[model samples]
Target: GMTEYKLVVVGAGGVGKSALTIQLIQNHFVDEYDPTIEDSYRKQVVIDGETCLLDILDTAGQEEYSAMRDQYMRTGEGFLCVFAINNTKSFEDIHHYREQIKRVKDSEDVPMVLVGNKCDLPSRTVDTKQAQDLARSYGIPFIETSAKTRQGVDDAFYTLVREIRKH
Candidate 1:
């Protein structure tokens, strides 16, 4: 059977949401912090022997959209709750995004992954321990990624796809 996973990327502005999405779809890092209102990309990949289509939506990180965000969140089968490891404020905002996704889905459990992006940066504000504790509390997988260096980028997305399958 063919399967398509609807994945939504959410995070605060400048948190590398677009960078991560572009890295996975384009296989290259996007250096600029171009603000995105919305963008979508589709890619066919094999994960764990299952060929799957990933429908990735790079949602706007700007504070201008909530109703629109909720709309996308409603249709998402899984989500990548991304934050920058070098940005403490971005890390703090992950909770609100997580809560919003759960509320929008109206489920106690949801297929989601906590992603700490920009791992390639030398300076760090959010530690692995903190992120892991947050993920542990939420009962979700935690991954650190560098959209620039391509570390853990695929794992972050594939893990969420697997989560959706299990759900």
Candidate 2:
């Protein structure tokens, strides 16, 4: 049987949201990525033995979209909180995003995956331990992924789905 799962990919601008989505959905990589309009949603097929549909809500990075982002967060079964491994500011912003997730999600038990993207660049590694620890504190899964290299990307999303299935 096929099931539908709603997931949201959220982060500040240039955190590799588009890159991650393209890699996960199309298995293609683009060097130059651009941000899309605020509050746009995209669909992708996720097959894990049984076919599953992924409704990915892509929100804008601006502060004005916070309310709308929270609204979409409320509707999703899970979330992928993305941050660039090279950018410390993006990593720091994860807390605010996590707080928004808690507010929108009706129950605190909703599954989340903390994604540290752009791991292909070794020189840009930012506090990996801290990122994992934060995810652990939130009781969510964590992974460092690289859309450019297709490393750890599949594992991150599949782990989230697996966690959702458990509950």
Candidate 3:
């Protein structure tokens, strides 16, 4: 049987959500940030020798989608909630994101991963402990990623897949 999972990438605007999603589907990293609508990408990956298809939706972090919580909760098997390390406000928004997912799913335990993106940036504000502690508080997995350097990008997705597999 073919294993397939629908994953939604959500975050505040300019958080590199698209960059990370694009990196996962395509090999190279993106240099510029452009406003795009909801983009879909299908990537076949082999993790631990198990072949799986990742049906990923890169949700627009634009303010226009602010009230569309219902649509987001309906879109994925698991979620990669991203925040830029340098953007403190982005980090601050994590609770609302998780709460909406929990509220819509009607369960506190959701298959989700906390992603701290742009780890390679020079002036990073949100540290690993802060992000990890937030995830730890919810008993979820957290990963730090730099799409530019291709660091921890795969781990974030694979970790989310593992989280999905658990439930």
Candidate 4:
């Protein structure tokens, strides 16, 4: 049997959403030296040895598209909430993100992953403990990853797949 799933990757702009998607899908990191075009997406990856197809939905982080963000969350089976570890404001804004997720998700216990991107930048870390606490409050798995270094990237996707298999 084919086990298919939809996953949405969302966060504020410049949080490395596209980079992470590209790395996960193609196993190559996109250099930040280039400009990022808005609202583009691609098939990001296949998880669990290709048992599941991970359709990555990349969305604009601008506040102007809040409505569209809500709409995407409603249709996805899972969500990868990406935030830059170096940006404290991005981490704080996660509260609003959680609220939006609740409003869109039909199931109260929907699977979600809190991703702290750019973990390779140690000097940029705002508060590691705070991020973990937030994830715990929402009852979702948490991971700090670096698309450039590929640290904890695979673990994040694998963890989500393990959680989904439980459901």
Candidate 5:
């Protein structure tokens, strides 16, 4: 029998959260960076040689709706905590996001993937080794990706799904 999984993507505003999500499920890069309003996407993906349905929740980064995020966080089976590598502030917000997800989901062992987007660009503010070190400390998988170049986008999702199943 097939299974269904729900993954929520959360990050501070302007961290390329929407773009990374659209790229992951649609395989298309949209240059437009319009703000998202809790968009949801469903895709039938083949993972571990088995068919599965993935329901992804793409959330807005706007601060006004901060409380709304918890609702999504509560319902998620796993999470993809994203941050922009070029912005150190955005990178710092991932820690808060991780704490919020754990608080809302009430699971310290929530399956999560730490994603550092915009790897294709230059002038990175967050060092790769530092990101990996944090992931190692948290005991989660860390992946650097470029939505513009379509690098490691699928790897992020596949790894997260596998972890969710493993957990």
Candidate 6:
């Protein structure tokens, strides 16, 4: 039997939360947003010779929906903290997001990955070094991903599962 990892995708708006996830499961790219997000998806995959099932929940990025986020965070076994490389404010929001998870779980250590999405864009306001530095400080892995081009998307989600398994 395979283990199921409950993973959550979180970030501020327009950072491709749905993009990274849909591309991973749906096997294509989506560039626009539809307000009616069903919020959860599941898929089975092989990682490091072991079969694993990923139960993912893609959260809303809007601030009005903030009150409902903690319930999702509480159930998630691990999380992908995504931010666009070109968005400075989104990058800054990672701290609160990570802290929120820690508060909900009541543990400083959790399975998480700091994801820098939209890496294919030439205009980057957040440097690679800076991202690595943030990840290092968080004591989590940092991965650069481009959902549009399907770069590093698999690794970002897989790495989070790996963390959950180890924990």
TM-score, each model? 0.94, 0.86, 0.91, 0.83, 0.93, 0.93
Query: Backbone collision count in every prediction?
Result: 0, 0, 0, 1, 0, 0
Candidate 4 stretches with Cα past 4 Å from truth are 33-50, 64-70
For 59-150, candidate 3 gives per-residue lDDT tens digits of 77344434474776576889999999999999999887887677667887889999999999999999889888998998889899999999
Q: Can you write out model 6's per-residue Cα lDDT over 1-167, one digit (the tens) per residue? A: 99899999988778899999999999799988674474889899998898989999988745542546666668899999999999999999998889888887789998999999999999999999999999999889999999999999999999998989878
Q: Evaluated with TM-score, which candidate comes out highest? A: 1
In candidate 5, stretches whose alpha carbon ends up further than 4 angstroms from where it belongs are: 64-69
Q: Which sequence of candidate numbers ranks them by TM-score, best first?
A: 1, 6, 5, 3, 2, 4
Model 3 regions lying over 4 Å from their true place: 61-72
lDDT of each: 0.90, 0.78, 0.86, 0.74, 0.86, 0.89
Which stretches of model 6 miss by more than 4 angstroms? 35-38, 61-69
Clashing pairs in 4: 25-44
Of the two candidates 3 and 4, the one with more favorable TM-score, higher being better, is 3
TM-score of model 2 relative to the true fold? Answer: 0.86
Scored by lDDT, the top model is 1
* Residue pairs that clash (backbone atoms under 3 angstroms), model 2: none
Pick by lDDT: 5 or 6, better one: 6
lDDT for residue 97 in candidate 5, whole number 0-100: 90
Give lDDT tens digits, candidate 4, residues 1-167. 55666767777777787788777777888866233354434443456566566666765535544676567668777778889999988887777777676678856787788999999887775577888898898888889999999998778766766666666
| Model 2 weakest lDDT span, ten residues long | 36-45
What digit string (tens of lDDT, one per residue) describes model 1 on residues 1-167? 87999999999888888989988999988788569557889999999999999999998745544786668769999999999999999999988888888898999899999999988899999999999999999999999999999999999999999999989
- lDDT value for model 4: 0.74
**Model 5 pairs whose backbones collide:** none
